[PDB]
Design a protein around this ligand. Structure first.
Ligand SMILES: [Ca+2]
Ligand SMILES: [Ca+2]
Ligand SMILES: [Ca+2]
Ligand SMILES: [Ca+2]
Lengths: 508, 518, 508, 507
């Protein structure tokens, strides 16, 4: 039962849209023998478009988690949708990984989502490996790309591979550890950075490689396990994903260095995966676009066995998991068992919520499962006023399943919806109609961001509430929330109240 | 003369690549009856690909500036290449405009180049009109787009038009000043006059045509009225406020509204400061300044120096005074830029750009008058964003390399740095293409083959300090990271962002600038 | 019982005299801790006889431990005590270690001993000795081995410089450099910059030569080594104990454990529970009046146990083995047991002959135990024909004990002795006198070489005999033998009679 | 990979000649669909005749589909081509089907093949054949099977009448009657419809079924799989009657490919890595040729046409490019194979009986047996100069299971031991064709053989001294008693009760 966890590697790719996530995912799948999934994923929208396919077909349930073997390792790749189906779940999914793979477009460097996803990873000091993609086209200087990562993303860079040329004159990569050159020939290998054959085939590029490698080892850091595991250092790899080049070097360093499933804290103790008793937590729910839903559970300890009895901690109730969805690529049936690090899909009809902890009787709740500051806001109401209670009931449940956040402004009876991605508004409106027979209408509001408000000094907090009530609300969890009409307003308010904490995350 | 000036509008579009500048340019050209030209720019790349194309056709300089009539106005649009042909010239072109038109991809909002080009504009408080493009596709929420502009770009937003719907349900725009709705109806925006217009935001006809979009509009406009500013000419002319327009350039929608407000509100040619007096465009005597130089790639060794007319009148074949060379020259056949022209014009006016032919006697920042000696100020260098050591395979060609690099620097082709503690030569560029142009020029004009090497430099700042005791002290601790540029200005070459910060905090009495007067 | 076989390594050193066998042997004993033995190890046959009379058998076999292995090194005397026993000893090994003088290359005995090993396709490991002095070019040495010895060379270590500028060796499999610093500094990586700092130009020449070797040579592959088609090459200086360790570690790792042997019927495997073995060498006591002899037996299967009953197949009766000579270094007395691969010395007085098979009852005879073409020939007669009977009785016995070969021409009445080594004549002369009170005299004969004649076609053979009987003889075992007056005569006869097989060896 | 093993049923038919094996095989092939193959075996000598034809293989194994099942039927030649290979084959099956001639009951071959099956406690199912002719009483047949074949009988079908008045069979489990009409089904043994059609036979059925209740056993799975109990079926193979019921119970109850012990550990079929073992070798008789086929049972992993295999005994990597497959109706050899299947390994004398194959892991499967020789002949040459060749030939022949070889302690003579008379012909021919030696046979005073085992070296040495005239070592170096008579073996075994005289030994 020790080797089942030992061989496992659970992770996700963080990247700004168009960096190369999908392209890389395909290649890694090819290395895993998953020729099936590989083609399927590349065979891939407005939010509306996603909903159309979603209803009729909606086979986005079988690829939210991609499990595949490589060497003597089992790799769990969790999906982080970034386009039409970007939602808060994209952030929350990172809570269920043990490390992350960051993809950067060499021509772009660090982008807005790169920063956001890193901030999320930063919540658990999640180890990061970096693939600098698209070397086959012109790029920013490699040193510049690295420097920016260190300054903006606040993490030391440690090159493991390095580009030879760029764009039209991209001739391959140099593995700093192997001291070998892999030639890019749309894979001849050459040992020794000083090997005279390099100068013969690559010319001036050969001495440029030597030049750059020297600059690197003077202004940069060498790879280091400890720093990497503490999230203070990231090994960098350069390649061209579309040409499946540099990927193999990345994957080998990944399985070798990336962490196996780690333990997680609870409201009582540290749970380690090697414990014989089963346990896990729910971090994502998606409903059938029917009334059944699938709650994605990361196993935290013990083992899962089909048809087993488990303890639903919140509901103080024993349950039986009869046919939990598993994610082995190419499988025909659900696996009979699963292990720590793995994800399983729990079928239900509304009895499972975000953060739900499952055990075998022991009553604890896993911590660290976050809500994230909403980025998009809308007022929600009905045309038929006689349906208010069902609207609230629906929104509450939806809030509990992480589909949306819900805000009740102090000075009114209005309801405000908070979303991280545009699709959530579509999913809410549909689910409300289908599951609650409630027809809702959206309106624009003057809110652009949100912060949770925290002050242990109740006299200060009370003066704050009195003054800022127009911009205050309670969310679905009862937490005081500041809904800023503008970034500038947020700045002024925060500056006006240095005694009050304004947070971008909170525990669900 | 004063009438010639009054009808002119000289501007450039500022935007991040892919935002829609080329598309908007096409549509503006069509409004100006420049059908042929619109077609050409529309039929538009690694830096190497650009180099090839340039060598083959070499007519990227005749469209560097696009002049076209609209109503009783004459419009001068200076291009700001943002793709393969991005270079320092892209920043410096902004010194030659009287206002700017910012284009934003509504699905993207404010991007890195948007920010950078706004910084350049800020140097002169250049007035900004804003166009939010791509409404025909899903966008970020309108109110959010505006907040990011005010927050990131430090300028008040003043909606003049406003979107009705978005993406698949984008149905038109409301004009806040006209109180009128222009319906978006593909197939009716090819020729002017065929589109449907509705009077009044509370007009019942709206609810008929657009349904729930009508009440959403009414709601959003009230939010905007309460949290936004109304358009105000003074704030606009001061560069503190930007009127916002929304549309879909590819479908020629919302463009007419933008163009009409532009010609109405955008400033005509303005006075330009000098080392002494202020020069006003209405003055009788001709004068101007050179703000960029483009070399003929095709055994040619002629170049075009782009000059903005600051006052008076250019006449083909006129005598003029080259202030730097303290010499009289003749201007026999300067390039002009009227769309669809058969030949260069006989005259040009303030706000206009003309192209002066020369073989290296004209440099960036050069002032030309009719006798008066003064130099226009405010023509900037901008901090280089790319760095490379340059050297030779043959030591015997050092003199030619230096001569070439010195001329190229003086023509703005590149920046040139000489570290204090070495004899090495470092080239500084804003755009990747500059290194290609420099290498080609060195070979073709100076018969010198240069070799580039990466160097440990990511950014640079010009160093200024009143107290010379502190400064000279500073030149001791940091000489290894110091250099003199081609103008003899002390420059700090930061190996990293962190190093710059750390050096700057240690020396707060020392100013570190990202721009300097050329 | 199986473990005991797996840990054993039985081998012999094959080499031309003065190549460095004694020196390398000394160093190998040192690695095994046989300090004393290494010391003892370190003219004419007349002198060797004297030392043998005055005072060998205890060191004919050298057994010593090394790590978790037990090594049996069988001696192959090449100086004054060289005899046919030197050849026949190789039939009792499972592999061989060839030592070559880097200054000499392939020499006459190198060729003969390889020919003997080739009989059983004996696996060969090669040590190129004397790197501390000038040598023949390394590429030359290997080509001579491949061309002359008909075996592929697979470099495993490679020399750095030579003679005065000998700096050490490169291990191709470890990619590590061992510095020869005569007072064991190891440098990792052939492209490691520390190499150029310490070895200067020799580093680049090394990398050049390794490239040449890669291209025109073979990498080690054990199937080929074990088949006798490929020999791993090691370089060093035995006198300086340099490069010996690498060889030894590869030896115990790659060299085969005791293997099964064929018999006149079934194949016999070492792991079988029953004891069995064969006699490959015999040595008599040179003491006047004594009849003591030691029959060297290799154990083919089962376990030797002191005082055991064994079956003497030729004599078809049961005997007892009370105090068999054993060969552990530094031993005090003969071991109480021994296992497959080991040699033991059977005490007797003439009842044990070359080829004798011993079992625990089963009736079979091991095959492949060879006679080798004699290289020296002499007529043997008496001054006084009085004891002619005793002479013939002695020569017969000596021939059966491998001390000499005996030929009796088809057409005449002379007795002709054949020897591989000069010493044999001295031992025969001395043994006849001391054991058969016969004084023999030798006479030169016009014979330079011998070949056993084989032909299944009686008519052809009779035709052959009618023309060549003058050159034909029966040997001691009744085998037809051609005695050539000259090399040319043999070539002419062989070319005239291609239907007839002329062999340089036969089954004893 | 899991269902691959679970869908396979590998067995063999055990019976005395003339019982009905050939006929039942045909019927089984029919249910499967292999009409052609079935029609072939129907076209069915002395050893002399067989040797003739065999000069001028693919039906040694008969693989065929039935529902969700794949059936591997290993043949067990009982007539002219009966040899030791016939016994050794059974080591390659996971269960067996016993066919008995109703008029005869348990016959000599029946007993021998059951003894072989017993070596592995091989599950047995039984088919009492030829109900259409007069028979021994059914209770008598069951009784004989019990005491003689030491296995409890568990009827699943039962005959109604016999000879002239065979009217059908009764299915004790289903409680249904299938009528024999040269296939009407009736339910309830006490169904009044039986009496109407069959008459007094209806009461006789009820009577006998009740008799079976108290004196016989009910089919018990665990017991059957343990080899302690065999389900009994009745019918007439010539009329394809009662056959269907046997097949269905077979595919349902018969065990899937089981694991096999080795010198190192128990190897399971489910294992990823490919492994197998040779239990039979067939030589091409055609003159000049030197090719053989080594039949290999797959114990684990999977066979892939063109895979790399590890020849354990030779410590050598080999390549299996075109291994013979035995799917009925096949156009070419199969690209893959799974545990329980048999494939043919082409070679020229480098593969031997007992040979294990893996993918690098060096171990050797166990339980592959040698069986006591039943026929004996002295072998010699008229040309004494070929003694070496004879021995080399005979040794090789011995390792390929073509014969056993014995060397008596008190002479230099060579005795061959065979199970089937054909082996002598095959050996004489092979010695000639492959070793160019002409052997001569002479009768010997030996009728049977037992392997001598005894851990008491004190007793063993005296035994050897006293009985040396009847002792020899075989081709594996095992001490063997060669009895001049049955009575001699009985006495000898009584005078030495501390010595084990076995009829089998691991090869
Ligand atoms: Ca609930
Ligand atoms: Ca100049
Ligand atoms: Ca004798
Ligand atoms: Ca063999």
């Amino acid at each position: 039962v020790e080797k089942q966890t030992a061989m496992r590697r659970t992770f996700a790719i963080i990247s700004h849209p168009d960096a190369g996530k999908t392209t890389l995912t395909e290649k890694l799948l090819l290395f895993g023998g998953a020729i099936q999934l590989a083609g399927t994923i590349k065979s891939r929208h407005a939010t509306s478009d996603w909903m159309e396919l979603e209803k009729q077909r909606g086979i986005s349930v079988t690829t939210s988690v991609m499990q595949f073997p490589y060497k003597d390792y089992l790799i769990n790749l969790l999906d982080t949708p970034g386009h039409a189906d970007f939602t808060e779940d994209t952030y929350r999914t990172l809570t269920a990984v043990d490390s992350a793979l960051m993809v950067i477009d060499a021509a772009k460097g660090v982008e807005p989502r790169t920063i956001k996803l890193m901030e999320v990873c930063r919540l658990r000091h999640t180890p990061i490996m970096t693939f600098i993609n698209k070397m086959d086209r012109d790029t920013r200087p490699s040193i510049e790309l690295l420097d920016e990562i260190e300054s903006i993303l606040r993490i030391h860079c440690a090159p493991v591979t390095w580009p030879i040329g760029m764009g039209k004159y991209f001739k391959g990569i140099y593995h700093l550890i192997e001291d070998a050159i892999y030639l890019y020939q749309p894979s001849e290998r050459i040992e020794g950075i000083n090997n005279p054959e390099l100068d013969k085939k690559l010319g001036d590029l050969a001495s440029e490689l030597r030049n750059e490698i020297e600059l690197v080892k003077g202004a940069s850091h060498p790879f280091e396990r400890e720093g990497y595991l503490k999230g203070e250092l990231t090994p960098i790899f350069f390649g061209s994903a579309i040409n499946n080049f540099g990927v193999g070097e990345l994957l080998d360093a990944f399985v070798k260095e990336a962490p196996p499933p780690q333990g997680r804290e609870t409201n009582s103790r540290l749970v380690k995966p090697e414990e014989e008793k089963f346990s896990g937590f729910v971090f994502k729910i998606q409903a059938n676009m029917h009334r059944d839903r699938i709650a994605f559970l990361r196993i935290a300890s013990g083992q899962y066995q089909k048809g087993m009895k488990a303890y639903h901690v919140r509901l103080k109730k024993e349950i039986q998991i009869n046919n939990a969805l598993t994610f082995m690529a190419g499988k025909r049936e659900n696996a009979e068992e699963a292990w720590p690090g793995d994800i399983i899909g729990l079928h239900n009809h509304g009895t499972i919520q975000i953060g739900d902890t499952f055990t075998q009787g022991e009553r604890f709740k896993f911590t660290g499962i976050p809500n994230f500051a909403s980025e998009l806001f809308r007022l929600v109401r009905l045309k038929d006023p006689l349906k208010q209670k069902a609207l609230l009931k629906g929104l509450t449940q939806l809030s509990e399943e992480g589909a949306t956040q819900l805000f009740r402004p102090l000075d009114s009876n209005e309801l405000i919806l908070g979303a991280v991605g545009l699709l959530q508004f579509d999913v809410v409106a549909y689910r409300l109609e289908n599951e609650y027979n409630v027809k809702c209408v959206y309106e624009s509001v003057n809110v652009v961001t949100a912060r949770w408000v925290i002050c242990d000094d109740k006299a200060v907090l009370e003066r704050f509430n009195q003054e800022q009530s127009r911009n205050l609300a309670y969310d679905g969890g009862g937490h005081l929330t500041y809904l800023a009409p503008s970034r500038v307003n947020l700045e002024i308010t925060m500056e006006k109240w240095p005694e009050i904490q304004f947070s971008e995350t909170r525990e669900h």
